Amino acid sequence: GPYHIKYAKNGTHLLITGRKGHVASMDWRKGQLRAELFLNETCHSATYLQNEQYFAVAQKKYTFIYDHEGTELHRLKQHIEARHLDFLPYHYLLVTAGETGWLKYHDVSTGQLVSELRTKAGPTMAMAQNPWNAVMHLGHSNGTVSLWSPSMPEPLVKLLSARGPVNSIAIDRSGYYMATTGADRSMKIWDIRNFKQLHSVESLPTPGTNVSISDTGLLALS
Amino acid sequence: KNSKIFSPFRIIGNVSNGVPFATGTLGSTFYIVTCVGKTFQIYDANTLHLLFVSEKETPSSIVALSAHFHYVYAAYENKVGIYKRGIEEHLLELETDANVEHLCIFGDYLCASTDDNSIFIYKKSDPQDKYPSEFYTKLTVTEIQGGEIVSLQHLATYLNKLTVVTKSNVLLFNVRTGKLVFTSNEFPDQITTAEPAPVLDIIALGTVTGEVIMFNMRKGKRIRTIKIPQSRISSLSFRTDGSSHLSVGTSSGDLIFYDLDRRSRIHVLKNIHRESYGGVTQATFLNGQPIIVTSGGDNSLKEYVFDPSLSQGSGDVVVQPPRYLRSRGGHSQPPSYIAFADSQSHFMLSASKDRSLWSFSLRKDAQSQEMSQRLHKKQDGGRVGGSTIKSKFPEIVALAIENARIGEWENIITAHKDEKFARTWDMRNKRVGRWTFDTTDDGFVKSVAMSQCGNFGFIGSSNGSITIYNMQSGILRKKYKLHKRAVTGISLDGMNRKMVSCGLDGIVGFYDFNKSTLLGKLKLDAPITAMVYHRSSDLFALALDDLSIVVIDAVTQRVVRQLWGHSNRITAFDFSPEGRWIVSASLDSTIRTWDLPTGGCIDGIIVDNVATNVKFSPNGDLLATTHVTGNGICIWTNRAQFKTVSTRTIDESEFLNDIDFNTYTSLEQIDKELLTLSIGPRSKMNTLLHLDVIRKRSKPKEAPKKSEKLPFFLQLSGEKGFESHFTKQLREGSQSKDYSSLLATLINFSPAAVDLEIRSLNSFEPFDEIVWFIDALTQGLKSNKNFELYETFMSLLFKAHGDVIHANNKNQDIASALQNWEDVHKKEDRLDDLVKFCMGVAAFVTTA
Amino acid sequence: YKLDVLSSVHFVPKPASTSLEIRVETPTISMEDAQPLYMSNASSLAPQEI
Amino acid sequence: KSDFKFSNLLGTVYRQGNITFSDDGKQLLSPVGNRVSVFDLINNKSFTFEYEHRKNIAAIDLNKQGTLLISIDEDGRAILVNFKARNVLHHFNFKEKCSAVKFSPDGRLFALASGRFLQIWKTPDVNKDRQFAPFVRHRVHAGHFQDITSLTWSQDSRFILTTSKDLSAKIWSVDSEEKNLAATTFNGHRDYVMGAFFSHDQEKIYTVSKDGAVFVWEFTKRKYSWRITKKHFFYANQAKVKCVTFHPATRLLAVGFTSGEFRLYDLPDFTLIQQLSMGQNPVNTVSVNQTGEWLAFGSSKLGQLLVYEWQSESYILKQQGHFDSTNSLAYSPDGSRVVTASEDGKIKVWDITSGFCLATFEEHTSSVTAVQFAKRGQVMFSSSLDGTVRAWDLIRYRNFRTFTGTERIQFNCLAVDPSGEVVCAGSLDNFDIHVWSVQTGQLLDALSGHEGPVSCLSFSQENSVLASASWDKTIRIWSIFGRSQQVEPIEVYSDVLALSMRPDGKEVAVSTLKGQISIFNIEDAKQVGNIDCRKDIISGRFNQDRFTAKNSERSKFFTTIHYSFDGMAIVAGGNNNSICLYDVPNEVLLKRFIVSRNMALNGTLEFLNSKKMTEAGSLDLIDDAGENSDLEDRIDNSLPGSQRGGDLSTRKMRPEVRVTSVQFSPTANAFAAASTEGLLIYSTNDTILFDPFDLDVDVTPHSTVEALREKQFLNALVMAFRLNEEYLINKVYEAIPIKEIPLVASNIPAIYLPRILKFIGDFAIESQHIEFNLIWIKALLSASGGYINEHKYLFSTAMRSIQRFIVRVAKEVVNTTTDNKYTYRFLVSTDGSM
RNA sequence: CAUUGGUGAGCAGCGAAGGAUUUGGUGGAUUACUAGCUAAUAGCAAUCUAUUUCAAAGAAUUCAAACUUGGGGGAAUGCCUUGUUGA
Secondary structure, eight states: OOOEEEEOTTSSOEEEEOSSSEEEEEOSSSOOEEEEEEOOSOOOOEEEOSSSSOEEEEOSSSEEEEOSSSOEEEEESSOOSOOEEEEETTTTEEEEEOSSSOEEEEETTTTEEEEEEOOTTSSOOEEEEETTTTEEEEEETTTEEEEOOTTOSSOSEEEEOOSSOEEEEEEOSSSSOEEEEETTTEEEEEETTTTEEEEEEOOOSSOOOOEEEOTTSOEEEO | OOOSSOOEEEEESOOOOSSOOEEEEETTEEEEEEEOSSOEEEEETTTOOEEEEOSSOOSSOEEEEEEOSSEEEEEESSEEEEEETTEEEEEEEOSSSSOEEEEEEETTEEEEEESSSEEEEEEOSSTTSSSOOEEEEEEEOOTTTOSSEEEEEOOTTOTTOEEEEESSOEEEEOTTTOOEEEEOOOOSSOEEEEEEOSSTTEEEEEESSSEEEEEETTTTEEEEEEEOSSOOEEEEEEEOSSSOEEEEEETTSOEEEEETTTTEEEEEEOSSSOTTTTSOSEEEEOTTSSEEEEEETTTEEEEEEEOOOSOSSSOSSSOOOEEEEEEEEOOSSOEEEEEEOSTTTOEEEEEETTTEEEEEESSOTTSOEEOOOOOOOOTTSSOOOOOSSOOOOOOOOEEEEOOSSBTTBOOEEEEOSSOSEEEEEOSSSOSEEEEEEEOSSSOOOOEEEEOTTSSEEEEEOSSSEEEEEETTTOOEEEEEEOOSSOEEEEEEOTTSOEEEEEETTTEEEEEESSSOOEEEEEEOSSOEEEEEEETTTTEEEEEESSSOEEEEETTTTEEEEEEOOOOSOEEEEEEOTTSSEEEEEETTTEEEEEETTTTEEEEEEEOSSOEEEEEEOSSSSOEEEEESSSSSEEEEOOHHHHSOOOOOOOHHHHOOHHHHTTOOOOOSOSOSSSOOOOSSOSTHHHHHHSHHHHHHHHSOSSOOOOOSOOOSOTTTOOOOOOSOHHHHHHHHHHHHTOOHHHHHHHHSSOHHHHHHHHHTSOOSSSOHHHHHHHHHHHHHHHHOSOHHHHHHHHHHHHHHHHHHHHHSTTOHHHHHHHHHHHHHHHHTTHHHHHHHHHHHHHHHHHHO | OHHHHHHOSOOOOOOOOOOOOOOOOOOSTTTSOOSSOOOOOSOSSOGGGO | OOOOEEEEEESOSOOSSOOEEOSSSSEEEEEOSSSEEEEETTTTEEEEOSOOOSSOEEEEEEOSSSOEEEEEESSSEEEEEETTTTEEEEEEEOSSOOOEEEEOTTSSEEEEEETTEEEEEEOOOSSSOOOSOOOEEEEEEOOOSSOEEEEEOOSSSSEEEEEETTTEEEEEESSTTSTTTTOOEEOOOSSOOOEEEEOSSSSEEEEEETTTEEEEEEOOOOOOOOEEEEEEEOOOSSOOEEEEEEETTTTEEEEEETTSEEEEEETTTTEEEEEEEOOSSOOOEEEEOSSSOOEEEEETTTTEEEEEETTTTEEEEEEEOOSSOOOEEEEOSSTTEEEEEOSSSOEEEEESSSOOEEEEEOOOOSOEEEEEEOSSSSOEEEEETTSOEEEEOSSSOOEEEEEOOSSOOOEEEEEEOSSSOEEEEEESSSOEEEEEESSSOSEEEEEEOOSSOEEEEEEETTTTEEEEEETTTEEEEEOOSSSOOOEEEEEOSSOOOEEEEOSSSSEEEEEOTTSEEEEEESSSOOEEEEEEOTTSOOOOOOTTOOSOTTTOTTSOSOSEEEEOSSSSEEEEEOSSSEEEEEETTTOOEEEEEEOOOOTTSGGGOSSOOTTTOBTTBOSTTSOOTTTSSSHHHHOOOOOSSOTTOSSTTSSSSOOOOOEEEEEEOSSSSOEEEEETTEEEEEEOOTTTOOOOOSOOTTOOHHHHHHHHHTTOHHHHHHHHHHHTOHHHHHHHHHHSOTTTHHHHHHHOOTTTHHHHHHHHHHHHTTOSOHHHHHHHHHHHHHHSHHHHHHTTTTTHHHHHHHHHHIIIIIHHHHHHHHHHHHHHHHHHHSOOOO
16 A cells, blocks of 8 residues: 555664555665565554564554564554554553544553543544653644643643644654644644744645654655 | 448557657657558557557558657648647648658757658747747758758757758758758768767768768768668667667668677667568667667567666676567458457457468457467377478468357367368467367368357368367267368358258258258359358358359248349358348448348448458447458448438439338327327326325325425525416317317326316306316317326316216206216227127136 | 344244234325335225224 | 347346436436436336446436436446447546546536546537547646545536535636636635535535535625635534535525435525435435426435425335345236345335336345245245245235244245145255145145255146255155145256246256256156256356366356246356356257346456455455545444345455346246346347248338238238338238228238237237227137137247236226216216205 | 286387477556646646745634443542532
């Protein structure tokens, strides 16, 4: 299928999921292929989890956590329909955010679901993490982004961002800015600390399908 | 030569005829514009599928082709036609009476060059136009300036200049003004091709001996020369990937690649196109790639690539030879025999006189393949023996196929020329089948046939004998002898019952086949040249020798029709799929369509090029014929599949309505005494009787929840006299004592409206309306049409006003009218008599 | 029901039944199914049953 | 005799796609599996087009002159059909999964929404004869960002409204003069845009969204341009819109929600006119007729078609079919009705001419495996895996009996006596043929003696013997009545699995597992001929197969068989893609019919595609329910390995083509075969094939017309029968006069008697000249009765057609005339009022 | 006497400038042919940017929102719903 990239935080390995079943985990510099899975349910996304030794892929319904070789370790039951995966890696928390519209933080080191939050605003269209902060920005079909935390049932802050749904958000390394992009052909640069939008671009020629803020504050939009 | 049943469609199995094709980038990708006589076809250069085909057949053949981004220019007899996506977008007639040889387009200018050395220049009206149309000027080549014109080029960066390479020198014109700014020194040979290089200033000129001159035009001097000795150069192309290569394509088929950095000869390719049909007519390196496309007048188009080196550093001293990427083709020589393979009208076998049997596709013209001849390992444990240098089978002159065992044993029989057996071919695997079928008295197979069930193959010879062979096992079963001269047609019934054979001693012999008796012997006048059988109806047609077609009923065993009217010998012919027509093509260049009911010609086409086979499709959409010159198959549609076709005799003039359209509209009412019903539907009676219970069944089970403020006159307000029309019409009918118009209205209401009116009759003291309605019904049953609906209306009237007339019974007017009603109706109880008798005796006859 | 669908119907049936039920006098056109024609007419009870 | 064309497709009313009304308001076109049907609502006449898509249909539109039809399947593969003469003009594939086609209301040019592009093309011309490419592109526009989903023209066809999954809608002009008039876009929806329509004079625009919301746009001041004047909202719980339509002359909006409701709104004010529950399943499409007052709903899940008359609330039709779920059929003893026994539990009496279910019986619980009429038209007996075999009346519509088991086994075949007093049934469970007596609902006997389950039963209707056959590898001929109780077995080579008795009662044809049809003689016990079949049978490969089709012995045998009513042909059909029609004396086959070409069924291709199979495995076999945008389309219940029971998605496998059961027609020249996509009904035209009889040189249509015009009526008639041309026979048939009818009927020849009977039947059921026909029939039977009586079997079908004509269409006219007569006599003789 | 079991040495017969098994690679077919890209009524294809921004239009369920859970007992602390004290 259409593919999906995830570079391991370290920098070395890469994980590509298809959309039909083709998952593969590789090294990309030495060319050596770690694992390869031809599972046929539509995968959506994947992450590495702490090493290259573990990864977690979405699937048709559940979440499957595999080894470094693709021997399946676990079938996560309680993460039903996770279109988005992320891993916040000092706290060791695998985070999925769904199509149900529920947000689940799962500790992959002891094996015990920490929190199960209810984002009530519908199926989550985008998701990113503040790395300096480890707090989850989920972007919702109202056009509003919302910042969560695991020990709080209510969103830490709601941020009315676009008109119509929020396609993709991406947060600086320094933990201080957030670019978000929206289906009304829009793109907005917010200053998360102090929560004011810096400056906003209001007519792109076709919707911003993705954004990413690099390791040097440089912005990529697609 | 306009016809009334068949119309021409396209001509399958042509790829190139030898005009140098043109190429066109379109974006990042390439297309190939080739011309086939009077058309041009456009191929996806990456995978070679047939994108487009020229829309209408040009008046003459196409002399020159050139392409650009979305447009493609063809210069036929006198004119230049600019086409986009196939459809003609501009004509451009050149003010002369001499043909257009060459053609080059650069910038604002189109440049056409006639044969009497003249150059016409057409300039765009404004550069926001997309192809030029203003006549600009007309530059001419006087014989002291140069020989005849050979080609037109425009080198890069040359502002308003045109490089005219003539047969002795190269000229440079300044086409905006048109002063001959430059002449080159006379070459001591004949120049044959020219082509511009991807270096600046330089045109590569290929002479008539093996000499390619790289000629620098800004300086006007040669910079290089390259000698092939004893070849005729016919193509030049400059590989522009980055490796400095050259492909000279000789007019013998060699294609010789030079390496111009290292002065070497990289390679040759030998017999990639045939020496006779022209050699290599065009051979181009696609701009940017290691791909060369070559095309020659043997109806084929080929693509060769360059693999990269094997060696890491040494690189471009080890050059890999160029191998063969992909190609299409057709027959080189005109075809010899055609036959539809399957009954969806998908695939068509056709054998051609270069001994090659293609199988063409009518839907997608990439599915077409050549049926290979790679023999099987002999089944005996021996050696099959032939000349070790291989050559194709002799020309396939008869051919018969069945699709009933496809996949399990072979199912084509072919009969070759001056050769004494037949070969079973395959059709699933597309390959020569494992059996060869002898004739066993030294006689050349003159005609072949296959059983319906696909088990048996009959092989009539030329000394009379008939041999029958099993096809699963190739093994000889039976052998009859009845003829003494040649045997020119064999046939077998679809019940495997009766066999027919027709032979040049003018005999048609009929055999039984389950058992082996001889069932009859019919004798005609003349030799019998061809048999076509038609199976579903058991009729067959023998093309005799005395220029006649004779149709014979293969059961009652006698001649049923005799179609005269031809004038030279009959080449070939075919029954319709439905058994009704014969198409027959004869050597006076005509094709005639005969109708067998009326036994006479109903159509005829006079063809400029004699037709030599004629075959319907089995699913009867098309007619495929094939002609004496030109490699293809001409496909024709069938207006009788879409329309009505009048059957009348015409041949006198060129070379009732019931029958002539063979359709009969039924009568309204035969006799005045004879009953009828209503024409229309049949459930009109039953809905008019039970209109209420039906609607109460139909109503939805609950109630529908609606709003509370409903704008009461909605049936009115969907936007965009005194008495009712029916009652008015009834009243004037009662005045004039004629209710014809009333009965028109009651026949052509609807059930709701009928019930509404008959409820809405007046029913009070002077019962004028009930009296007048009953009078109208009496008059209707008298007129004796529509017995059905007049009885139905009377039943409705008794339902909706039976109370008032039962009460006001023995009022005189109602008494009188109901008596007159009873008059006609008691006359009409005979119908119940008939029906009672019919099913009494019918059920008795059935049950006993 | 699930166990029949799983077993791909080849089961063994119920034991039995016999349970009384009530039918109404009604015309046959009012009994059948909704489409422009009709097929049958006679009333749904029999003369002996009325 | 052996020329059969695809007449009709019965038993399916709608499968998927888009429902359209005609230009007239009269006919209704609706896509069955990969074919369009035309159901004619006024003249009560149906048909099914002959051409077939290679996958299921997904868009149709019909021209405004009623002339061309374009049907696009999934994957853009359009086919253009000449609607008048029913023969395909041009195949053309648009690559993408195309989603709607609308002709222009002028009928010049047709617009097609494919992907995110709008391609406007021009029609061909119907008068112009065919060519290589007649579709000439007009423009392609490219506004949207995701798929288009809908498409609406102007009433004066120059503006086009497209709605798209973009959450938006756009107006495109049709002239590059008027681009400025139409460059704007619409906005603000939250969810999708499932329709956007024009007003009645195009000064207002409405846009309807899946979220449940209707916007009213108007070109107005606070220059000024296109505000949202109003917003109205539906308020469903969790239903969403699934299809919207707007008839602008009446200003109706009819909206089909995903729960089973639909609502008819009156739009420039938004008042609820009406609201009803169609079913319980999402309504998939809506249309309306022209004048605005027959709505047309269609619901693909469970497959039901409904046509509504919203003024006075009345279903003009409310019907529903069976995909894949039918186990048998059996004709009425008249060729007009057909009964289908469905896997649900439902038995449906289907009319033939107008393909609509007259009646539906649902007293069974589990699937229904066999149906037979009696030798009557009254009762039919039906057998199901309930465990009971139930008798049905068909005048008062009732179970008058249910014979039961004695331990409740699962009954799998049914057979019942001519004088319908004894019913035998046999199961695949017990291998003992149970015999019940009809009147006393108790079971007479359990005829036992097979060793292996009973696969078929039948009754020789002449001599009354019960021949049954079982996986025993035997046949047993039981002679049940009349002090005998003796039984005679026959060994067949292998494992028999269907049976068929001759009409005559002397022969049994038996279709076994090795692939023969062995035809035995019953008075003796001896085999008077078999026909070897394993070869001429087209078994395809499944996508889930790992073995070639030439080895796949899933389907190299015939599980159903039936003689003719003449004694000469056998139709057999099976678990494969082909129906084969053999001739019984000559042992050689006449035609092989292919049931379908539908690559959304499994057994249908012979050779798969190697572009599909890859390292993962096959490529049609991944799951894509994740790709779907809707919860009920993601949910995949499927109890693992549930081979053919339960609903269609209670298994994760694609359907297989199979013929469940085959029969001939007892009156016409046809046969009918119940298969995966419905009941294929195949039939015949003498009015097309030239099949003369006993010709000679001097017999032309011109000569027979001449024989009429000099009045040798007998000779003109026999020349018509020799030439065998239907118009001609009709012509002379109506020429000859009523005084001269009896002498001619006496002097006709014996050879042409069956043909004249066939012609009278074919003219008679649908013509009007009832005196002409009944005078003819009376003379024909009257002068040649006894000959018919002797040759009882050549005339089986012919006399059944005449007898159906008499009791079906003549007899009612007798009834109404007689009723009327007696009412008059009562009204005018009785005592006066008061 | 068989061998319907191997492993070989030899004929008859077939037999045109050789034959017989095995295997890698690429091309074409496997569904019925209307050309490439983009911001798309057009331009590009040697190039989208030194007009690529404006104006207009565009903001319900004031939160419908897991139709998404293997069975049995439960729930300190969580979560959740209903009440409540003080601001």
